Amino acid sequence: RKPPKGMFLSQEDVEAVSANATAATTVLRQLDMELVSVKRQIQNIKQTNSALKEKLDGGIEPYRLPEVIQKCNARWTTEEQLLAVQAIRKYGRDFQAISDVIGNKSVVQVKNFFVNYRRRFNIDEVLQEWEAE
Amino acid sequence: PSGVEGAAFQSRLPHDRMTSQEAACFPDIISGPQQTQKVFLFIRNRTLQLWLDNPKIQLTFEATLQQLEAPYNSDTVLVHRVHSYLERHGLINFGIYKRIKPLPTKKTGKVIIIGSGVSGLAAARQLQSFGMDVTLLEARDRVGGRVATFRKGNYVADLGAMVVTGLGGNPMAVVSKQVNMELAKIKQKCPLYEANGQAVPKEKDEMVEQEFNRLLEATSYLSHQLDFNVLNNKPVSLGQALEVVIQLQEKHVKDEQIEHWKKIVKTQEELKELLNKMVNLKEKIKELHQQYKEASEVKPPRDITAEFLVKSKHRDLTALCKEYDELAETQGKLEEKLQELEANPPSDVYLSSRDRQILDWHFANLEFANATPLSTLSLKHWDQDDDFEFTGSHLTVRNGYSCVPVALAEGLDIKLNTAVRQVRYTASGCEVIAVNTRSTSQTFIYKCDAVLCTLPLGVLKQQPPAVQFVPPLPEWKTSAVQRMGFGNLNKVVLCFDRVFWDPSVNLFGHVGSTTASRGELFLFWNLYKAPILLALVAGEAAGIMENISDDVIVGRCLAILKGIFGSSAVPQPKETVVSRWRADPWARGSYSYVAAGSSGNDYDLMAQPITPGPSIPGAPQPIPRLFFAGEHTIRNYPATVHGALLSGLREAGRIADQFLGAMYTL
Numbered sequence: 160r161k162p163p164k165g166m167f168l169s170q171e172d173v174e175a176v177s178a179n180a181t182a183a184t185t186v187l188r189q190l191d192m193e194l195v196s197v198k199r200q201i202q203n204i205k206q207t208n209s210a211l212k213e214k215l216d217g218g219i220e221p222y223r224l225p226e227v228i229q230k231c232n233a234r235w236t237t238e239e240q241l242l243a244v245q246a247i248r249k250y251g252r253d254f255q256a257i258s259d260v261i262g263n264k265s266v267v268q269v270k271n272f273f274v275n276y277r278r279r280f281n282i283d284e285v286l287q288e289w290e291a292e
Numbered sequence: 293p294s295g296v297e298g299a300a301f302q303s304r305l306p307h308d309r310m311t312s313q314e315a316a317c318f319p320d321i322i323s324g325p326q327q328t329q330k331v332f333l334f335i336r337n338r339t340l341q342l343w344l345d346n347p348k349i350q351l352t353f354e355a356t357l358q359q360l361e362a363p364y365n366s367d368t369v370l371v372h373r374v375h376s377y378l379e380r381h382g383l384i385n386f387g388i389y390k391r392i393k394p395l396p397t398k399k400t401g402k403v404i405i406i407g408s409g410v411s412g413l414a415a416a417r418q419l420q421s422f423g424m425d426v427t428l429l430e431a432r433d434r435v436g437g438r439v440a441t442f443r444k445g446n447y448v449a450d451l452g453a454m455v456v457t458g459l460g461g462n463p464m465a466v467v468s469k470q471v472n473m474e475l476a477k478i479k480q481k482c483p484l485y486e487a488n489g490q491a492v493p494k495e496k497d498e499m500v501e502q503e504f505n506r507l508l509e510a511t512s513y514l515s516h517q518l519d520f521n522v523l524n525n526k527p528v529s530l531g532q533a534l535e536v537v538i539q540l541q542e543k544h545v546k547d548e549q550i551e552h553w554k555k556i557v558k559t560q561e562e563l564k565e566l567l568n569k570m571v572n573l574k575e576k577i578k579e580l581h582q583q584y585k586e587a588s589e590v591k592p593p594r595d596i597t598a599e600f601l602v603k604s605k606h607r608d609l610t611a612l613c614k615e616y617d618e619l620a621e622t623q624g625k626l627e628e629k630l631q632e633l634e635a636n637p638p639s640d641v642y643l644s645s646r647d648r649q650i651l652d653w654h655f656a657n658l659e660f661a662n663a664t665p666l667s668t669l670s671l672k673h674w675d676q677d678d679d680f681e682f683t684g685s686h687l688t689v690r691n692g693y694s695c696v697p698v699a700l701a702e703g704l705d706i707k708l709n710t711a712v713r714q715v716r717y718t719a720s721g722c723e724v725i726a727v728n729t730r731s732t733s734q735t736f737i738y739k740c741d742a743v744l745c746t747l748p749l750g751v752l753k754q755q756p757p758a759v760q761f762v763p764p765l766p767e768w769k770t771s772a773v774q775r776m777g778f779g780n781l782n783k784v785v786l787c788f789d790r791v792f793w794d795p796s797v798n799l800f801g802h803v804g805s806t807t808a809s810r811g812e813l814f815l816f817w818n819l820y821k822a823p824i825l826l827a828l829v830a831g832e833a834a835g836i837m838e839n840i841s842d843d844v845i846v847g848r849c850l851a852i853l854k855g856i857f858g859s860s861a862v863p864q865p866k867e868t869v870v871s872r873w874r875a876d877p878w879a880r881g882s883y884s885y886v887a888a889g890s891s892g893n894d895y896d897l898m899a900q901p902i903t904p905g906p907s908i909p910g911a912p913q914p915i916p917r918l919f920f921a922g923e924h925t926i927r928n929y930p931a932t933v934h935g936a937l938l939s940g941l942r943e944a945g946r947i948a949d950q951f952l953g954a955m956y957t958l
């Protein structure tokens with residue numbers, strides 16, 4: 160039915176090792192070369208990789224900024240509002256980043272904000288200028 | 293199987309069906325009612341059973357009907373017709389029985405038989421027992437032909453045939469009850485020993501052998517499923533087909549490695565892309581932090597745009613930090629899914645050089661079995677006879693196989709030292725011209741009705757011809773002699789004063805160094821009651837060794853043996869002999885094999901008798917005058933003693949029918 164399993168014998172493969180007198184050792188040699196030609200290129204990219212690993216030595220540890228553990232609120236200090244208006248100008252609809260900047264406001268109180276003061280913060284204008292960048 | 297059916301199987305016949313050659317003679321029965329067929333079969337089986345249960349006496353028609361049963365023993369023409377058919381084609385009362393009716397007064401017809409090789413002998417006995425006038429002519433000075441047995445003191449060793457292939461329907465089964473042969477079984481246990489002289493680990497031994505058998509079947513797949521049977525016009529040998537498979541195996545071995553490391557790179561190159569991303573992130577993260585530090589040194593109280601800047605850069609940073617943690621995350625996964633790959637490479641090699649070399653011994657063995665370079669065996673047919681193999685385990689003749697021809701020869705007219713030189717056969721008779729081997733000018737002429745020719749195929753192949761046919765053999769027959777393969781294999785006989793090998797071992801192998809010399813003394817046999825060792829030279833090596841003195845040969849022998857058993861546990865051999873069968877003029881080789889571009893159907897050609905032209909033109913078409921038996925003539929049991937013996941029965945049956953008339957076909 161099939162070759163006794165372990166042995167590999169494609170139809171196509173046979174016609175290929177018969178073709179001529181030494182298609183035999185020809186095709187067996189393409190792969191012999193073809194192999195070292197990869198083993199070598201493994202080295203190259205193992206080395207290229209290795210230098211880039213030394214750059215990264217240090218991690219980012221000297222650059223990480225401590226935990227802002229602060230708690231969500233409801234009031235809108237005039238400070239908080241101005242922070243917002245500026246976050247919008249620099250962030251667009253990224254409600255998440257905008258919340259992050261004002262520290263103590265939920266990603267929703269934000270979306271909310273967008274619709275209350277929409278009025279007198281010309282948030283239309285503001286936004287169309289974030290778009291213009 | 294067992295009972296009556298035991299006999300049918302033990303006689304090489306389907307217990308529950310009539311054979312083609314039975315149909316031949318009982319065309320009434322086989323074309324007739326199912327009922328009658330089944331009577332017949334029983335009658336046949338039963339008669340066989342009787343003969344078999346006891347083959348040291350003749351089985352008469354009376355003695356049969358005697359032990360038969362109603363309903364069966366009702367119709368006595370059926371019984372007669374069956375017991376006769378059986379008798380005639382040597383299925384019963386063949387070999388060496390005691391007569392009951394000593395041999396009918398005067399004879400009938402005269403037959404010359406060429407060569408008293410087993411085939412010859414068995415046919416001659418048959419004929420003589422059928423009351424015919426039989427003379428055999430033998431070139432040699434002993435009977436047996438290719439059944440040589442060496443004798444001297446208590447040394448006893450066949451340079452001829454050696455093995456009985458197990459009694460499961462083997463005719464030799466009977467022969468061995470009729471003649472005192474001591475049959476010792478062949479303990480299948482065979483240790484190997486490299487060129488160095490050290491055993492091959494049970495570990496290896498099995499890996500290689502098992503790969504060997506795997507390789508064989510492989511070829512079979514190629515042959516039947518892929519149809520790899522012609523190749524730019526030549527028939528494909530088994531050798532070719534094996535190398536092609538081995539190549540394909542090595543090809544796959546590489547194929548794998550290639551796509552395995554090809555996996556390493558595609559991974560190691562993601563690691564590369566990630567790192568770049570990672571560096572260029574630490575790059576913004578560096579400079580970005582700076583800017584936040586700078587924006588923090590504007591001391592409060594500060595206005596809102598400057599307060600924003602701090603808070604903003606702070607988020608932008610903890611954002612960029614987020615990403616880089618997730619990227620060293622990813623980094624870690626890859627770095628391990630990478631010793632993953634370095635931990636399990638595909639196999640280094642297909643076979644090592646110590647492997648390829650042991651495997652090579654397994655090939656030598658196959659060459660020894662077929663007496664030939666696998667480069668010459670037909671891929672498609674090399675093993676066609678595989679189906680008809682007997683059941684039970686191979687044996688050896690402990691007292692020398694020769695005891696068997698000698699046995700058969702007893703009672704017969706045999707002209708020893710009589711080399712047939714010309715067979716001429718014509719409408720009205722044949723004449724055979726032999727000479728005396730000792731003074732070759734001294735001449736002989738024999739006239740007969742038929743010639744049975746049991747000349748070795750080697751002989752029939754000879755150029756230019758050692759026996760000349762008059763008229764020449766028809767072209768269809770000569771082409772078949774060309775196409776078929778007559779092989780070669782040789783033995784070396786070593787005779788010592790003491791056992792020094794493993795006494796409980798029958799056979800150990802030696803592993804040669806090169807492909808080229810796999811056959812050279814590749815296997816040794818402890819078979820006998822005396823301290824005798826027996827070594828084979830098979831394959832390509834066989835033919836080459838016949839050109840090298842006995843000493844040199846026995847040299848390489850002791851050499852190999854010391855190497856295995858210790859450089860002085862091995863004495864000098866008291867007595868040594870060395871066959872050269874391809875040399876030997878009355879054999880010109882060892883036994884036939886299915887050469888590439890031949891088939892089984894050629895063995896059938898070999899057996900077809902010859903029919904001379906007519907004398908006076910437009911006279912009636914003659915009887916066939918020239919017939920053939922011997923090892924190369926029996927499609928289903930080539931190259932063997934039983935195969936020969938049986939070809940002999942075959943032709944004798946056929947000749948008797950022709951000349952004494954088949955009374956039983958009515």
Ligand SMILES: [C]C1=C([C])[C]=C2C(=[C]1)N([C][C]([O])[C]([O])[C]([O])[C]OP([O])(=O)OP([O])(=O)O[C][C]1O[C](N3[C]=NC4=C3N=[C]N=C4[N])[C]([O])[C]1[O])C1=NC(=O)[N]C(=O)C1=N2C(=O)/[C]=[C]/C1=[C][C]=[C][C]=[C]1
Nearest residue numbers: 407409411431437438452453454455712878922923932933
């Ligand atoms: C060689 C060999 C060896 C070494 C071994 C063996 C063998 C072989 N095998 C085989 C057998 O042997 C055979 O087959 C037989 O024997 C054969 O027989 P036949 O056919 O009969 O033939 P021969 O014998 O040869 O005879 C013939 C005769 O003739 C004569 N001649 C010639 N010429 C002439 C004459 N005459 C007159 N004139 C002229 N011209 C001669 O001389 C002779 O006599 C085997 N088998 C078996 O069974 N077993 C065994 O064992 C064997 N062996 C081995 O070892 C192996 C192989 C095998 C086995 C098993 C299976 C398979 C294989």
